[PDB]
Amino acid sequence: KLKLYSYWRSSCAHRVRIALALKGLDYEYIPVNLLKGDQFDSDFKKINPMGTVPALVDGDVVINDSFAIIMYLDEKYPEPPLLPRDLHKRAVNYQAMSIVLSGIQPTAWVNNAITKGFTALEKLLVNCAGKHATGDEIYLADLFLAPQIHGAINRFQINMEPYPTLAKCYESYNELPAFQNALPEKQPDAPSST
Amino acid sequence: KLKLYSYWRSSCAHRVRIALALKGLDYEYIPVNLLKGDQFDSDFKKINPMGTVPALVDGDVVINDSFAIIMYLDEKYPEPPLLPRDLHKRAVNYQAMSIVLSGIQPTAWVNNAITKGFTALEKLLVNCAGKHATGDEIYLADLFLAPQIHGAINRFQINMEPYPTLAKCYESYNELPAFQNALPEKQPDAPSST
């Protein structure tokens, strides 16, 4: 019985929710309101000593970090694979992951940090033929791109026309249930329509 | 005939040099002076369009990003393995990698960003019994910790006594040839003794 400590608006938790949905894995969604500071609660700290969200609990095992959680899921529950067979395409997926993870993540506001990272991702992925980031199946890069692009568009009003490959990728996720289900607005702790 | 575009003081390139040495892989060291701005040279840009260092050239294939390069090497040349068999220990290695990659990396100066990241790494690794970060063999976390600790000590004069697990790890690398050989001061472009 997996548990996922998640916050509806966290892009890192969004990545993990896609992975769980693509693996067909059921889990208990445990909301952690990051705006309200619920991650500094001492009982939560008891269960999740690292203190970060997302956090996956798999029995006695607690995994933090979106990338480490996703790799643990892919290695424990291999089907469908989140990495391709081709060593070069696997390297592109890891590079795309790292630009998002460590490149970008960390009147009107102009966000050119995104410009910079999206330019690199476009540079990296434009030569990968296919429906999604690296081919016609969904892989690790796609789980990193979807939440990043959703956040760029919804929080920074970034225009995606300068990044046609990225735009293709993001449009390609609109019909995939695993991706639709994992969206921030669909989560149990998301702001209501009621 | 592998090629590695490297800069002697780059901690990211330091990580990759350890991996190449542990895999017993020969390569052409191509210096890229990052202080002098050699990475913005147009011919280098032709070979390495992504423009970053380190960059591994494996024939026609150019891989950027320290983590993606190291994974490509581990997957193409599996021996000795840079990840353990145990799924949980593999997850710890990826978490340690991510704290360094995306947590830390990006009168006297006091560097408490390091304090923060080293505190998390200590928290993460203290329950892993063994000579090195996650056991008695060298894995991915160790390739990320060595350059980070070398840089903390040599550029920021960080005292390692508050992080006994990390200190153990770093002392454990002093006798390993792969680690000694990859040090910044030993590289072809490093400042001279002459």
mmCIF file of C-alpha atoms in Angstrom:
data_model
loop_
_atom_site.group_PDB
_atom_site.id
_atom_site.type_symbol
_atom_site.label_atom_id
_atom_site.label_comp_id
_atom_site.label_asym_id
_atom_site.label_seq_id
_atom_site.Cartn_x
_atom_site.Cartn_y
_atom_site.Cartn_z
ATOM 1 C CA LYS A 1 0.000 0.000 0.000
ATOM 2 C CA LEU A 2 1.994 2.945 -1.317
ATOM 3 C CA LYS A 3 1.499 6.403 0.133
ATOM 4 C CA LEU A 4 2.398 9.689 -1.578
ATOM 5 C CA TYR A 5 2.832 12.913 0.389
ATOM 6 C CA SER A 6 1.865 15.484 -2.181
ATOM 7 C CA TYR A 7 0.868 19.104 -2.645
ATOM 8 C CA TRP A 8 -1.484 19.898 -5.543
ATOM 9 C CA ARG A 9 0.575 22.778 -6.956
ATOM 10 C CA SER A 10 4.028 21.227 -6.497
ATOM 11 C CA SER A 11 5.559 20.550 -9.909
ATOM 12 C CA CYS A 12 7.901 17.965 -8.308
ATOM 13 C CA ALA A 13 4.925 16.059 -6.895
ATOM 14 C CA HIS A 14 3.169 16.451 -10.307
ATOM 15 C CA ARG A 15 6.074 14.535 -11.969
ATOM 16 C CA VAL A 16 5.686 11.612 -9.534
ATOM 17 C CA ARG A 17 1.882 11.497 -9.948
ATOM 18 C CA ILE A 18 2.337 10.953 -13.686
ATOM 19 C CA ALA A 19 4.743 8.082 -13.027
ATOM 20 C CA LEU A 20 2.318 6.362 -10.611
ATOM 21 C CA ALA A 21 -0.552 6.742 -13.117
ATOM 22 C CA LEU A 22 1.547 5.368 -16.025
ATOM 23 C CA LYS A 23 2.616 2.374 -13.897
ATOM 24 C CA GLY A 24 -1.073 1.688 -12.997
ATOM 25 C CA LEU A 25 -0.157 1.930 -9.307
ATOM 26 C CA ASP A 26 -2.773 2.676 -6.623
ATOM 27 C CA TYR A 27 -1.801 4.821 -3.652
ATOM 28 C CA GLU A 28 -2.991 6.886 -0.733
ATOM 29 C CA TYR A 29 -2.714 10.613 -1.512
ATOM 30 C CA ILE A 30 -1.657 12.457 1.660
ATOM 31 C CA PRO A 31 -1.930 16.218 1.226
ATOM 32 C CA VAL A 32 0.843 18.453 2.566
ATOM 33 C CA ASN A 33 -0.046 22.154 2.252
ATOM 34 C CA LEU A 34 3.315 23.777 1.429
ATOM 35 C CA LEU A 35 1.946 27.361 1.538
ATOM 36 C CA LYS A 36 0.585 26.800 5.063
ATOM 37 C CA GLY A 37 3.839 25.202 6.231
ATOM 38 C CA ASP A 38 2.522 21.688 6.949
ATOM 39 C CA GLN A 39 5.900 20.227 5.906
ATOM 40 C CA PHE A 40 7.473 21.583 9.134
ATOM 41 C CA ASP A 41 4.993 19.726 11.345
ATOM 42 C CA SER A 42 6.802 17.439 13.815
ATOM 43 C CA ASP A 43 4.632 14.333 13.232
ATOM 44 C CA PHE A 44 5.120 14.501 9.470
ATOM 45 C CA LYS A 45 8.855 14.912 10.214
ATOM 46 C CA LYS A 46 8.669 11.661 12.156
ATOM 47 C CA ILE A 47 7.417 9.801 9.102
ATOM 48 C CA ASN A 48 9.459 11.856 6.597
ATOM 49 C CA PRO A 49 12.664 12.893 8.378
ATOM 50 C CA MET A 50 14.057 14.348 5.178
ATOM 51 C CA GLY A 51 11.023 16.666 5.345
ATOM 52 C CA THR A 52 10.515 17.198 1.643
ATOM 53 C CA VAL A 53 7.508 16.774 -0.658
ATOM 54 C CA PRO A 54 7.003 14.724 -2.683
ATOM 55 C CA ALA A 55 7.723 11.726 -0.494
ATOM 56 C CA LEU A 56 6.779 8.137 -1.355
ATOM 57 C CA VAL A 57 6.214 5.656 1.479
ATOM 58 C CA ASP A 58 6.503 2.023 0.455
ATOM 59 C CA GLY A 59 6.062 0.198 3.786
ATOM 60 C CA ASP A 60 9.120 1.008 5.892
ATOM 61 C CA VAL A 61 10.815 2.699 2.950
ATOM 62 C CA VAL A 62 10.520 6.439 2.495
ATOM 63 C CA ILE A 63 11.878 7.910 -0.721
ATOM 64 C CA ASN A 64 12.290 11.645 -1.260
ATOM 65 C CA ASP A 65 13.246 13.529 -4.421
ATOM 66 C CA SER A 66 11.077 13.434 -7.531
ATOM 67 C CA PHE A 67 13.800 11.857 -9.687
ATOM 68 C CA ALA A 68 14.804 9.238 -7.102
ATOM 69 C CA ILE A 69 11.112 8.346 -6.524
ATOM 70 C CA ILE A 70 10.467 7.960 -10.247
ATOM 71 C CA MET A 71 13.600 5.753 -10.689
ATOM 72 C CA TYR A 72 12.591 3.637 -7.709
ATOM 73 C CA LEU A 73 9.145 3.151 -9.243
ATOM 74 C CA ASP A 74 10.587 2.315 -12.671
ATOM 75 C CA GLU A 75 13.015 -0.167 -11.162
ATOM 76 C CA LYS A 76 10.522 -1.843 -8.802
ATOM 77 C CA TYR A 77 7.629 -1.887 -11.295
ATOM 78 C CA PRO A 78 9.279 -2.023 -14.704
ATOM 79 C CA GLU A 79 6.215 -1.960 -16.987
ATOM 80 C CA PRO A 80 5.686 0.269 -19.059
ATOM 81 C CA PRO A 81 9.349 1.262 -19.075
ATOM 82 C CA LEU A 82 10.115 4.944 -18.386
ATOM 83 C CA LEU A 83 13.441 4.700 -20.244
ATOM 84 C CA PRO A 84 14.012 3.519 -23.809
ATOM 85 C CA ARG A 85 16.399 0.781 -24.832
ATOM 86 C CA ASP A 86 18.740 2.931 -26.957
ATOM 87 C CA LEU A 87 21.666 4.137 -24.825
ATOM 88 C CA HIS A 88 21.841 7.477 -26.603
ATOM 89 C CA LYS A 89 18.078 8.139 -26.203
ATOM 90 C CA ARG A 90 18.402 7.176 -22.522
ATOM 91 C CA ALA A 91 21.178 9.766 -22.226
ATOM 92 C CA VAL A 92 18.931 12.441 -23.787
ATOM 93 C CA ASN A 93 16.209 11.577 -21.293
ATOM 94 C CA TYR A 94 18.632 11.995 -18.375
ATOM 95 C CA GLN A 95 19.896 15.316 -19.814
ATOM 96 C CA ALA A 96 16.325 16.622 -20.231
ATOM 97 C CA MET A 97 15.611 15.536 -16.627
ATOM 98 C CA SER A 98 18.710 17.340 -15.361
ATOM 99 C CA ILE A 99 17.978 20.650 -17.179
ATOM 100 C CA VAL A 100 14.585 20.724 -15.500
ATOM 101 C CA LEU A 101 15.699 19.360 -12.110
ATOM 102 C CA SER A 102 18.813 21.457 -11.617
ATOM 103 C CA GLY A 103 18.795 23.902 -14.535
ATOM 104 C CA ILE A 104 15.389 25.607 -14.164
ATOM 105 C CA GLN A 105 13.487 24.548 -11.039
ATOM 106 C CA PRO A 106 15.566 26.401 -8.433
ATOM 107 C CA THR A 107 3.873 45.927 -14.051
ATOM 108 C CA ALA A 108 4.582 42.318 -15.101
ATOM 109 C CA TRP A 109 7.283 39.828 -14.119
ATOM 110 C CA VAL A 110 9.447 38.566 -16.953
ATOM 111 C CA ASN A 111 10.883 35.086 -16.332
ATOM 112 C CA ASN A 112 13.952 34.636 -18.487
ATOM 113 C CA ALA A 113 15.358 31.803 -16.328
ATOM 114 C CA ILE A 114 12.622 29.771 -18.072
ATOM 115 C CA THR A 115 13.679 31.228 -21.469
ATOM 116 C CA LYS A 116 17.189 29.929 -20.824
ATOM 117 C CA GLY A 117 16.153 26.412 -19.800
ATOM 118 C CA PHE A 118 13.469 26.028 -22.426
ATOM 119 C CA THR A 119 15.978 27.138 -25.088
ATOM 120 C CA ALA A 120 18.327 24.325 -23.948
ATOM 121 C CA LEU A 121 15.537 21.745 -23.842
ATOM 122 C CA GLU A 122 14.450 22.726 -27.369
ATOM 123 C CA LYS A 123 18.058 22.478 -28.547
ATOM 124 C CA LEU A 124 18.338 19.035 -26.969
ATOM 125 C CA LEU A 125 15.059 17.511 -28.149
ATOM 126 C CA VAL A 126 14.518 18.948 -31.642
ATOM 127 C CA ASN A 127 16.523 16.147 -33.247
ATOM 128 C CA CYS A 128 14.520 13.357 -31.604
ATOM 129 C CA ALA A 129 11.878 12.229 -34.117
ATOM 130 C CA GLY A 130 8.571 11.259 -32.508
ATOM 131 C CA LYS A 131 5.281 12.208 -30.884
ATOM 132 C CA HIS A 132 6.791 12.914 -27.474
ATOM 133 C CA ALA A 133 10.175 14.053 -26.145
ATOM 134 C CA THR A 134 12.289 11.099 -27.396
ATOM 135 C CA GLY A 135 10.164 8.956 -29.704
ATOM 136 C CA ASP A 136 6.657 7.655 -29.899
ATOM 137 C CA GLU A 137 6.412 6.352 -26.327
ATOM 138 C CA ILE A 138 6.389 8.290 -23.054
ATOM 139 C CA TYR A 139 9.669 8.308 -21.145
ATOM 140 C CA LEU A 140 11.384 10.058 -18.214
ATOM 141 C CA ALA A 141 11.894 13.381 -20.086
ATOM 142 C CA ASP A 142 8.136 13.691 -20.655
ATOM 143 C CA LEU A 143 7.430 13.337 -16.916
ATOM 144 C CA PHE A 144 9.840 16.214 -16.306
ATOM 145 C CA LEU A 145 8.613 18.377 -19.199
ATOM 146 C CA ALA A 146 4.868 18.211 -18.534
ATOM 147 C CA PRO A 147 4.871 19.797 -15.021
ATOM 148 C CA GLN A 148 7.517 22.351 -16.019
ATOM 149 C CA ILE A 149 5.561 23.516 -19.075
ATOM 150 C CA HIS A 150 2.246 23.503 -17.155
ATOM 151 C CA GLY A 151 3.836 25.701 -14.506
ATOM 152 C CA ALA A 152 5.439 28.043 -17.103
ATOM 153 C CA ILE A 153 2.120 28.549 -18.884
ATOM 154 C CA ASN A 154 -0.098 28.750 -15.795
ATOM 155 C CA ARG A 155 2.128 30.718 -13.397
ATOM 156 C CA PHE A 156 4.290 32.797 -15.745
ATOM 157 C CA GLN A 157 2.152 33.091 -18.860
ATOM 158 C CA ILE A 158 5.045 31.888 -21.012
ATOM 159 C CA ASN A 159 4.367 31.824 -24.733
ATOM 160 C CA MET A 160 5.421 28.440 -26.105
ATOM 161 C CA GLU A 161 5.684 29.369 -29.800
ATOM 162 C CA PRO A 162 9.443 29.853 -29.705
ATOM 163 C CA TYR A 163 9.877 26.163 -28.662
ATOM 164 C CA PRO A 164 8.037 24.117 -31.288
ATOM 165 C CA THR A 165 9.451 20.776 -30.112
ATOM 166 C CA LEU A 166 8.412 21.541 -26.552
ATOM 167 C CA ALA A 167 4.999 22.738 -27.730
ATOM 168 C CA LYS A 168 4.562 19.493 -29.688
ATOM 169 C CA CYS A 169 5.464 17.524 -26.569
ATOM 170 C CA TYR A 170 3.034 19.375 -24.350
ATOM 171 C CA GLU A 171 0.164 19.125 -26.851
ATOM 172 C CA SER A 172 0.926 15.384 -27.104
ATOM 173 C CA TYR A 173 0.106 14.972 -23.354
ATOM 174 C CA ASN A 174 -3.406 16.436 -23.526
ATOM 175 C CA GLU A 175 -5.032 13.145 -24.589
ATOM 176 C CA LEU A 176 -3.095 10.803 -22.252
ATOM 177 C CA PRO A 177 -5.105 9.867 -19.189
ATOM 178 C CA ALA A 178 -2.047 9.372 -16.960
ATOM 179 C CA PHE A 179 -1.061 12.992 -17.666
ATOM 180 C CA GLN A 180 -4.581 14.423 -17.365
ATOM 181 C CA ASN A 181 -5.220 12.702 -14.054
ATOM 182 C CA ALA A 182 -1.951 13.932 -12.527
ATOM 183 C CA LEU A 183 -2.654 17.668 -13.210
ATOM 184 C CA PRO A 184 -2.571 19.976 -10.195
ATOM 185 C CA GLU A 185 -6.198 21.065 -10.671
ATOM 186 C CA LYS A 186 -7.441 17.439 -10.417
ATOM 187 C CA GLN A 187 -5.831 16.583 -7.055
ATOM 188 C CA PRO A 188 -7.700 15.961 -3.815
ATOM 189 C CA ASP A 189 -6.266 19.112 -2.169
ATOM 190 C CA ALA A 190 -6.716 21.383 -5.211
ATOM 191 C CA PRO A 191 -8.906 24.473 -5.031
ATOM 192 C CA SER A 192 -12.534 23.742 -5.524
ATOM 193 C CA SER A 193 -15.148 24.295 -8.177
ATOM 194 C CA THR A 194 -17.667 24.164 -5.340
ATOM 195 C CA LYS B 1 38.191 6.694 -28.759
ATOM 196 C CA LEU B 2 36.310 8.692 -26.143
ATOM 197 C CA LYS B 3 36.968 12.391 -25.710
ATOM 198 C CA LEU B 4 36.190 14.446 -22.594
ATOM 199 C CA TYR B 5 35.916 18.236 -22.716
ATOM 200 C CA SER B 6 36.964 19.166 -19.225
ATOM 201 C CA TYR B 7 38.108 22.044 -17.052
ATOM 202 C CA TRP B 8 40.459 21.208 -14.164
ATOM 203 C CA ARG B 9 38.509 23.106 -11.495
ATOM 204 C CA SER B 10 34.999 22.130 -12.619
ATOM 205 C CA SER B 11 33.402 19.928 -9.963
ATOM 206 C CA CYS B 12 30.970 18.568 -12.602
ATOM 207 C CA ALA B 13 33.877 17.478 -14.804
ATOM 208 C CA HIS B 14 35.610 16.066 -11.660
ATOM 209 C CA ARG B 15 32.608 13.706 -11.122
ATOM 210 C CA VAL B 16 32.898 12.346 -14.684
ATOM 211 C CA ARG B 17 36.689 11.880 -14.423
ATOM 212 C CA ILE B 18 36.169 9.588 -11.431
ATOM 213 C CA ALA B 19 33.650 7.518 -13.390
ATOM 214 C CA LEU B 20 36.027 7.107 -16.367
ATOM 215 C CA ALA B 21 38.882 6.083 -14.030
ATOM 216 C CA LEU B 22 36.695 3.547 -12.150
ATOM 217 C CA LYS B 23 35.522 2.036 -15.464
ATOM 218 C CA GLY B 24 39.188 1.724 -16.626
ATOM 219 C CA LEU B 25 38.325 3.789 -19.709
ATOM 220 C CA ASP B 26 41.000 5.645 -21.708
ATOM 221 C CA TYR B 27 40.155 9.013 -23.229
ATOM 222 C CA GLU B 28 41.465 12.194 -24.768
ATOM 223 C CA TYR B 29 41.338 15.064 -22.254
ATOM 224 C CA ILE B 30 40.396 18.273 -24.097
ATOM 225 C CA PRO B 31 40.824 21.318 -21.872
ATOM 226 C CA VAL B 32 38.164 24.039 -21.909
ATOM 227 C CA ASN B 33 39.206 27.066 -19.825
ATOM 228 C CA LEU B 34 35.909 28.216 -18.272
ATOM 229 C CA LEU B 35 37.431 31.328 -16.620
ATOM 230 C CA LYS B 36 38.806 32.515 -19.980
ATOM 231 C CA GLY B 37 35.500 31.838 -21.746
ATOM 232 C CA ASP B 38 36.674 29.080 -24.115
ATOM 233 C CA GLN B 39 33.226 27.440 -23.887
ATOM 234 C CA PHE B 40 31.748 30.275 -26.013
ATOM 235 C CA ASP B 41 34.171 29.641 -28.879
ATOM 236 C CA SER B 42 32.294 28.945 -32.134
ATOM 237 C CA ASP B 43 34.323 25.864 -33.179
ATOM 238 C CA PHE B 44 33.800 24.181 -29.814
ATOM 239 C CA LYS B 45 30.095 25.063 -30.219
ATOM 240 C CA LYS B 46 30.164 23.183 -33.510
ATOM 241 C CA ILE B 47 31.301 20.010 -31.780
ATOM 242 C CA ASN B 48 29.321 20.652 -28.566
ATOM 243 C CA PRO B 49 26.183 22.567 -29.571
ATOM 244 C CA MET B 50 24.818 22.317 -26.054
ATOM 245 C CA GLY B 51 27.949 24.286 -25.092
ATOM 246 C CA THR B 52 28.438 22.907 -21.614
ATOM 247 C CA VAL B 53 31.398 21.278 -19.853
ATOM 248 C CA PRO B 54 31.793 18.478 -19.104
ATOM 249 C CA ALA B 55 30.970 16.978 -22.476
ATOM 250 C CA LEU B 56 31.750 13.393 -23.502
ATOM 251 C CA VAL B 57 32.241 12.605 -27.196
ATOM 252 C CA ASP B 58 31.785 8.954 -28.088
ATOM 253 C CA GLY B 59 32.185 8.987 -31.890
ATOM 254 C CA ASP B 60 29.189 10.857 -33.290
ATOM 255 C CA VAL B 61 27.535 10.953 -29.879
ATOM 256 C CA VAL B 62 27.984 13.969 -27.647
ATOM 257 C CA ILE B 63 26.654 13.725 -24.108
ATOM 258 C CA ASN B 64 26.395 16.725 -21.797
ATOM 259 C CA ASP B 65 25.485 16.850 -18.108
ATOM 260 C CA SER B 66 27.612 15.145 -15.471
ATOM 261 C CA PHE B 67 24.801 12.829 -14.340
ATOM 262 C CA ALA B 68 23.716 11.866 -17.866
ATOM 263 C CA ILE B 69 27.372 11.217 -18.850
ATOM 264 C CA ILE B 70 27.958 9.023 -15.806
ATOM 265 C CA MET B 71 24.729 7.020 -16.472
ATOM 266 C CA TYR B 72 25.681 6.603 -20.118
ATOM 267 C CA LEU B 73 29.085 5.279 -19.060
ATOM 268 C CA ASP B 74 27.570 2.927 -16.470
ATOM 269 C CA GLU B 75 25.056 1.614 -18.978
ATOM 270 C CA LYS B 76 27.502 1.212 -21.885
ATOM 271 C CA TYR B 77 30.362 -0.177 -19.768
ATOM 272 C CA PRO B 78 28.670 -1.902 -16.848
ATOM 273 C CA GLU B 79 31.708 -3.100 -14.864
ATOM 274 C CA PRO B 80 32.308 -2.203 -11.971
ATOM 275 C CA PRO B 81 28.690 -1.191 -11.427
ATOM 276 C CA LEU B 82 28.090 2.382 -10.207
ATOM 277 C CA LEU B 83 24.736 1.399 -8.673
ATOM 278 C CA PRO B 84 24.075 -1.357 -6.143
ATOM 279 C CA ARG B 85 21.563 -4.140 -6.572
ATOM 280 C CA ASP B 86 19.291 -3.216 -3.638
ATOM 281 C CA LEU B 87 16.444 -0.994 -4.868
ATOM 282 C CA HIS B 88 16.391 1.044 -1.676
ATOM 283 C CA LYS B 89 20.184 1.656 -1.741
ATOM 284 C CA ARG B 90 19.860 2.642 -5.415
ATOM 285 C CA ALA B 91 17.201 5.159 -4.368
ATOM 286 C CA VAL B 92 19.542 6.622 -1.719
ATOM 287 C CA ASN B 93 22.252 6.981 -4.346
ATOM 288 C CA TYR B 94 19.882 8.882 -6.653
ATOM 289 C CA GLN B 95 18.745 11.117 -3.753
ATOM 290 C CA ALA B 96 22.364 11.895 -2.787
ATOM 291 C CA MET B 97 23.071 12.693 -6.468
ATOM 292 C CA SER B 98 20.066 15.017 -6.648
ATOM 293 C CA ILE B 99 20.918 16.970 -3.445
ATOM 294 C CA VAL B 100 24.329 17.716 -4.909
ATOM 295 C CA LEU B 101 23.197 18.243 -8.519
ATOM 296 C CA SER B 102 20.180 20.442 -7.882
ATOM 297 C CA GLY B 103 20.270 21.133 -4.139
ATOM 298 C CA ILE B 104 23.750 22.653 -3.661
ATOM 299 C CA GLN B 105 25.640 23.188 -6.924
ATOM 300 C CA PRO B 106 23.671 26.170 -8.258
ATOM 301 C CA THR B 107 36.122 39.888 6.105
ATOM 302 C CA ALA B 108 35.248 36.264 5.252
ATOM 303 C CA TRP B 109 32.454 34.696 3.202
ATOM 304 C CA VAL B 110 30.207 32.297 5.074
ATOM 305 C CA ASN B 111 28.631 29.638 2.837
ATOM 306 C CA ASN B 112 25.521 28.317 4.527
ATOM 307 C CA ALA B 113 24.021 26.975 1.269
ATOM 308 C CA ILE B 114 26.648 24.234 1.758
ATOM 309 C CA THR B 115 25.616 23.875 5.444
ATOM 310 C CA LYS B 116 22.060 23.212 4.282
ATOM 311 C CA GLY B 117 22.957 20.614 1.650
ATOM 312 C CA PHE B 118 25.593 18.873 3.717
ATOM 313 C CA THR B 119 23.104 18.637 6.608
ATOM 314 C CA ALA B 120 20.650 16.851 4.259
ATOM 315 C CA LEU B 121 23.328 14.541 2.867
ATOM 316 C CA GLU B 122 24.417 13.613 6.407
ATOM 317 C CA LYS B 123 20.788 12.972 7.352
ATOM 318 C CA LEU B 124 20.380 10.766 4.288
ATOM 319 C CA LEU B 125 23.577 8.720 4.528
ATOM 320 C CA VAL B 126 24.139 8.229 8.270
ATOM 321 C CA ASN B 127 21.999 5.089 8.313
ATOM 322 C CA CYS B 128 23.899 3.386 5.488
ATOM 323 C CA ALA B 129 26.462 1.056 7.091
ATOM 324 C CA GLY B 130 29.743 0.863 5.176
ATOM 325 C CA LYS B 131 33.089 2.347 4.192
ATOM 326 C CA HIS B 132 31.649 4.702 1.587
ATOM 327 C CA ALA B 133 28.331 6.490 1.029
ATOM 328 C CA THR B 134 26.080 3.396 0.689
ATOM 329 C CA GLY B 135 28.085 0.307 1.620
ATOM 330 C CA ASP B 136 31.531 -1.070 1.111
ATOM 331 C CA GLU B 137 31.760 -0.457 -2.643
ATOM 332 C CA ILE B 138 31.903 2.837 -4.540
ATOM 333 C CA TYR B 139 28.648 3.932 -6.156
ATOM 334 C CA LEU B 140 27.042 6.968 -7.828
ATOM 335 C CA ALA B 141 26.654 8.959 -4.558
ATOM 336 C CA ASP B 142 30.415 8.789 -3.952
ATOM 337 C CA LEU B 143 31.147 10.290 -7.389
ATOM 338 C CA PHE B 144 28.869 13.194 -6.479
ATOM 339 C CA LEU B 145 30.155 13.600 -2.910
ATOM 340 C CA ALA B 146 33.896 13.624 -3.612
ATOM 341 C CA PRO B 147 34.000 16.730 -5.890
ATOM 342 C CA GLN B 148 31.454 18.573 -3.736
ATOM 343 C CA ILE B 149 33.424 18.000 -0.524
ATOM 344 C CA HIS B 150 36.756 18.792 -2.239
ATOM 345 C CA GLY B 151 35.292 22.074 -3.447
ATOM 346 C CA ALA B 152 33.760 22.902 -0.016
ATOM 347 C CA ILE B 153 37.078 22.324 1.745
ATOM 348 C CA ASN B 154 39.337 23.924 -0.870
ATOM 349 C CA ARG B 155 37.224 26.909 -1.964
ATOM 350 C CA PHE B 156 35.127 27.654 1.126
ATOM 351 C CA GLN B 157 37.240 26.287 3.959
ATOM 352 C CA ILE B 158 34.274 24.306 5.274
ATOM 353 C CA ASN B 159 34.907 22.391 8.474
ATOM 354 C CA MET B 160 33.694 18.818 8.016
ATOM 355 C CA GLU B 161 33.430 17.821 11.692
ATOM 356 C CA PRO B 162 29.696 18.449 11.891
ATOM 357 C CA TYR B 163 29.117 15.771 9.172
ATOM 358 C CA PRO B 164 30.838 12.622 10.432
ATOM 359 C CA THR B 165 29.296 10.355 7.781
ATOM 360 C CA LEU B 166 30.407 12.727 5.046
ATOM 361 C CA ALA B 167 33.855 13.043 6.622
ATOM 362 C CA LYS B 168 34.131 9.240 6.726
ATOM 363 C CA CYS B 169 33.181 9.100 3.052
ATOM 364 C CA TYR B 170 35.712 11.697 2.003
ATOM 365 C CA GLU B 171 38.541 10.127 4.025
ATOM 366 C CA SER B 172 37.617 6.782 2.414
ATOM 367 C CA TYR B 173 38.461 8.232 -1.062
ATOM 368 C CA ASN B 174 42.030 9.272 -0.232
ATOM 369 C CA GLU B 175 43.502 5.817 -0.944
ATOM 370 C CA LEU B 176 41.493 5.013 -4.108
ATOM 371 C CA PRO B 177 43.496 5.620 -7.258
ATOM 372 C CA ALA B 178 40.445 6.416 -9.408
ATOM 373 C CA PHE B 179 39.606 9.259 -7.002
ATOM 374 C CA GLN B 180 43.187 10.501 -6.600
ATOM 375 C CA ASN B 181 43.789 10.606 -10.336
ATOM 376 C CA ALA B 182 40.593 12.566 -11.024
ATOM 377 C CA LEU B 183 41.447 15.448 -8.599
ATOM 378 C CA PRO B 184 41.497 18.942 -10.088
ATOM 379 C CA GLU B 185 45.161 19.500 -9.178
ATOM 380 C CA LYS B 186 46.251 16.420 -11.197
ATOM 381 C CA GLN B 187 44.644 17.397 -14.527
ATOM 382 C CA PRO B 188 46.520 18.370 -17.675
ATOM 383 C CA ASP B 189 45.241 21.981 -17.542
ATOM 384 C CA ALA B 190 45.754 22.441 -13.782
ATOM 385 C CA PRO B 191 48.075 25.123 -12.443
ATOM 386 C CA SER B 192 51.663 24.090 -12.414
ATOM 387 C CA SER B 193 54.267 23.155 -9.862
ATOM 388 C CA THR B 194 56.810 24.329 -12.424
#
